[PDB]
RNA sequence: AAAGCUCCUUCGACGAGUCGAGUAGUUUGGGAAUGCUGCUCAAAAUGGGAGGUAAAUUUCUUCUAAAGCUAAAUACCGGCC
RNA sequence: GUUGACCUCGGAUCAGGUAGGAGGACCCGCUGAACUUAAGCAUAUCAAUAAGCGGAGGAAAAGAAACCAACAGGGAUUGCCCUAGUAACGGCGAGUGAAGCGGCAACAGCUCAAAUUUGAAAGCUGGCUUCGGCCCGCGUUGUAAUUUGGAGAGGAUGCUU
């Protein structure tokens, strides 16, 4: 059980009251889940095929650049403010291996 | 033909009473199949992989020098798509490997090894690295020739 | 043109309604025609009930919360609960729904008890008649009265609660301490006010450093 | 398998070999005709996603298809009434460059079903497609419960009525409420909108 | 041989010029943009979409797109009775 | 070196097949008006209609959630009643206008991609065959078995089919 309810409407905790059950997990639930092999083959792909040029252009920006700049010009080559900083912390990653390789 | 008989003598043995797989012994064989191949150097049974330098859709195996590289197996690219075909008794397999060989040629599979090794991957060690040619044709490298020798 | 106190007009008719105009002279006919199909698929399916067992449900918004009614289907916990297998209860007559979730423990014992008592009504006759297994009905109680609509011999035997109940003085519960109405005023204050008084107190707490 | 390989490789459009192969790849469609034969896919991990099986009776074909908007095709661009309906130039045609693409290829080879198709390349001027084709005549493909289904009367010409995967898209048939207009067909739903209901008992 | 159930450390692959974003046109009751399409940009891995007011931040809920098949209840007197 | 493989691309009145047209009331799409109403008229309305084009069947289409919801939660699709002339849209004018829940009719669930069968391509088309099989071809750039998230795979375990 979470949280159990007020048995009132109107409040902070509204609701009837039942005993609420915890229950397994779907398989579905697991969709955004990592695996070993998928990791594998993402990263043996990424080497094999390198960066987008978008991508180098936000890498030049992060290593001896501004981040408000790469921020920026992430935001505006994906559309999307949280595409764009997970895009940002991927290529940190990026440039730090390759920095501390 | 080699099945059918196999599979007939199989059959007269469990017809006796004996049990399969005692007439018969295990089987060593060359492993092709793009997929079966890349599962066996994913799980490192593959002991040498020999990729056609003609795949049609180079994407079916381009990533395969990285994938044996990182998984830390001998490769080669050998010439001859229909070649590998005509060994395995395909058209095409454009991907062939080897695990396991039997004792009276363990010797001949670690000599094969080793040379394939020092005279293919020590060699294309840096050539392996680099953009191909941006070769022009016979008239334009003429004509560059004679610019220098021009200019010299 | 208006021309008196009139309701402002509003009739829908400014495009070509004569075009799709819906009659429904077919009305005895088609519950004719839709008694027969019933007929026929009671038949075809002889002694087996004409519906599947459905379980109870409670309808979703705060209106009709009230009420509980008939569900598409039960859940694979509510199965395996019962003890029965989930590819086996679509083929005795148990509709089955994967995607509803039991969050509750009584509408979960709920569906379980009514499950039970189903499997315990139920008669399965064998296969083949010459052999039967030891999970079928042994042809001595397979002769009985059965029901061949499970919507009214399994329906819904309450839908809401009991509107009228009696209780002696002396139990009668005390009250919310500052009145009913009090109370839901201070809960309804409260939740306007959750989150500026949760961000005021940690400003507060954070005005030290 | 090297399909799990291909599908990730694939997402790299903008990476050096995967750009390279499509400037190559598209050079080649370029010069070949309009509409041809493939002998293979030319992304055999996408073909097998969208259902193609290597075995005889599915065909592999290739369209290219002239790219932007739809003009409307009136003489010298007058159209004749009111203001609202003067445009001409920046119309936009309903359905996709994909189902053109499929319906001209269906055309080519009515004896068989257009099963699925992908885009394969990009151009300033041309878009290019691979359509997946059955053959509902072949045997191997009617005796297969997997795939006979295409072999009903009711699956002729997919492509056509808008069956196909591009088809579903154009026409908005997805669950929930932003696609309350078009779930159950959108001229059949505004028909049941539209339509007076009068019983005997009024 | 094949099949179901009872428990379990672990593992648990899941659809890309696709989603999404911008802009233009059309459409919708959908209103800082409901769907569709053209062009440009172009993803990710507890990720992604949605949660009917545009935005940043933090939570929660709900499903699992970009592949496919499937009676019935429904329309229709065009055709044959 | 030539032949011989395989890769594309062709010829043939080659062997066997398939499509066109009709019908189009109803159905699935595309394309697409103006009369009219607004007491004028341009947005709007008529109308996402008529006309035009393509494609099916006895029904078609849709369909087993990237759904609805916000609840004590519902649970593929379709249709009727209601929601409701409501929320909303609209020179906020004329006018237009759904959906969730709820009752009912009818109810049905499923299969592919993504895994190595690898101790044996186990799969399929065509031809011949006494019926046991044979041959060619397709296919490893993947045809069978297993798996589809409701899980499953791997192990235990004893019953059951
Ligand atoms: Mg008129
Ligand atoms: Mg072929
Ligand atoms: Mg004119
Ligand atoms: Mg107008
Ligand atoms: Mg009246
Ligand atoms: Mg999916
Ligand atoms: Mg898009
Ligand atoms: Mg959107
Ligand atoms: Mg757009
Ligand atoms: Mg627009
Ligand atoms: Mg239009
Ligand atoms: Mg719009
Ligand atoms: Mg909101
Ligand atoms: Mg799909
Ligand atoms: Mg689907
Ligand atoms: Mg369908
Ligand atoms: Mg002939
Ligand atoms: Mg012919
Ligand atoms: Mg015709
Ligand atoms: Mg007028
Ligand atoms: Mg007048
Ligand atoms: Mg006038
Ligand atoms: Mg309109
Ligand atoms: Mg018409
Ligand atoms: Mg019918
Ligand atoms: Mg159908
Ligand atoms: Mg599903
Ligand atoms: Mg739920
Ligand atoms: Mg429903
Ligand atoms: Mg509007
Ligand atoms: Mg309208
Ligand atoms: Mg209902
Ligand atoms: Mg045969």
Not at chain 1, 48 to 70: F, H, S
Not at chain 3, 11 to 21: C, D, E, G, L, P
Not at chain 3, 136 to 153: F, G, I, Y
Not at chain 4, 84 to 105: D, F, H, I, P, W
Request: aromatic content about 6%; charged content about 35%.
């Amino acid at each position: 059980a979470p949280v159990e309810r007020t048995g009132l409407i109107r409040g902070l905790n509204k609701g009837h009251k039942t005993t609420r059950r915890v229950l397994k997990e779907r398989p579905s639930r697991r969709k955004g889940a990592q695996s070993k092999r998928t990791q594998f083959v993402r990263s043996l792909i990424r080497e094999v095929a390198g960066l987008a040029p978008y991508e180098r252009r936000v890498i030049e920006l992060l290593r001896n650049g501004k981040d408000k700049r790469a921020r920026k010009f992430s935001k505006k080559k994906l559309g999307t403010f949280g595409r764009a900083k997970r895009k940002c912390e991927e290529l940190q990653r990026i440039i730090a291996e390759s920095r501390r390789a | 033909q080699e099945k059918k008989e196999r599979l007939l003598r199989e059959a007269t043995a469990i017809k006796e009473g004996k049990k399969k797989e005692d007439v018969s012994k295990k089987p060593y064989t060359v492993k092709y199949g793009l997929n079966h191949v890349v599962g066996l150097i994913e799980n490192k049974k593959a002991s040498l992989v020999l990729i056609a330098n003609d795949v049609d859709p180079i994407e079916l195996v381009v990533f395969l020098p990285a994938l044996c590289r990182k998984m830390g197996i001998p490769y080669a690219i050998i010439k001859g798509k229909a070649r590998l075909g005509t060994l395995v008794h395909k058209k095409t397999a454009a991907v062939v490997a080897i695990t396991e060989v039997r004792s009276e040629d363990k010797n001949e599979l670690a000599k094969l090894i080793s040379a394939v090794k020092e005279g293919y991957l020590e060699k294309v060690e840096d050539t392996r690295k680099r953009w191909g040619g941006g070769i022009m044709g016979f008239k334009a490298q003429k004509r560059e020739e004679k610019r220098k020798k021009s200019l010299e | 043109a208006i021309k008196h106190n009139q309701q402002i007009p509003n009739n829908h008719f400014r495009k070509h309604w004569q075009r799709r105009v819906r009659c429904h002279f077919d009305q005895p006919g088609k519950k004719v025609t839709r008694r027969l199909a019933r007929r026929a698929k009671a038949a075809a399916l002889a002694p087996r009930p004409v519906d599947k067992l459905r379980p109870i449900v409670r309808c979703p918004t705060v209106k009709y919360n009230r009420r509980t009614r008939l569900g598409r289907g039960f859940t694979l916990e509510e199965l395996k609960a019962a003890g029965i297998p989930r590819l086996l209860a679509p083929t005795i007559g148990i509709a089955v729904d994967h995607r509803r979730k039991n969050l509750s423990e009584e509408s979960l014992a709920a569906n379980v008890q009514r499950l039970k008592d189903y499997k315990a009504r139920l008669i399965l006759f064998p296969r083949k008649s010459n052999k039967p297994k030891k999970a079928d009905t042994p042809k001595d109680q397979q002769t009985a009265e059965t029901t061949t609509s499970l919507r009214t011999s399994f329906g819904v035997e309450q839908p809401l609660a009991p509107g009228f109940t009696e209780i002696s003085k002396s139990e009668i519960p005390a009250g919310i301490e500052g009145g009913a109405y009090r109370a839901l005023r201070k809960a309804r204050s409260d939740a306007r006010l959750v989150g500026v008084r949760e961000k005021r107190a940690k400003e507060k707490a954070e005005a030290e450093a | 398998g090297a399909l799990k390989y291909l599908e990730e490789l694939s997402k790299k459009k903008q990476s050096d070999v995967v750009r390279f192969l499509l400037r190559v790849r598209c050079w080649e469609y370029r010069q070949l005709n309009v509409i041809h034969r493939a002998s293979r896919p030319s992304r055999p991990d996408k073909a097998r996603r969208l259902g193609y099986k290597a075995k005889q009776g599915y065909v592999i074909y290739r369209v290219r298809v002239r790219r932007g908007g739809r003009k409307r095709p009136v003489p010298k661009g007058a159209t004749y009434g009111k203001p609202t309906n003067q445009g001409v130039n920046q119309l936009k045609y309903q359905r996709s460059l994909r189902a053109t693409a499929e319906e001209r290829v269906g055309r080519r080879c009515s004896n068989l079903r257009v099963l699925n198709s992908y885009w394969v390349n990009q151009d300033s001027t041309y878009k290019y497609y691979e359509v997946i084709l059955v053959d509902p005549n072949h045997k191997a493909i009617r005796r297969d419960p997997r795939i006979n289904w295409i072999c009903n009367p009711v699956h002729k010409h997919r492509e056509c009525r808008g069956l196909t995967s591009t088809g579903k898209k154009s026409r908005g048939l997805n669950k929930g409420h932003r696609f309350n207009k078009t779930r159950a067909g959108r001229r059949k739903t505004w028909k049941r909108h539209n339509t007076l209901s009068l019983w005997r008992y009024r």
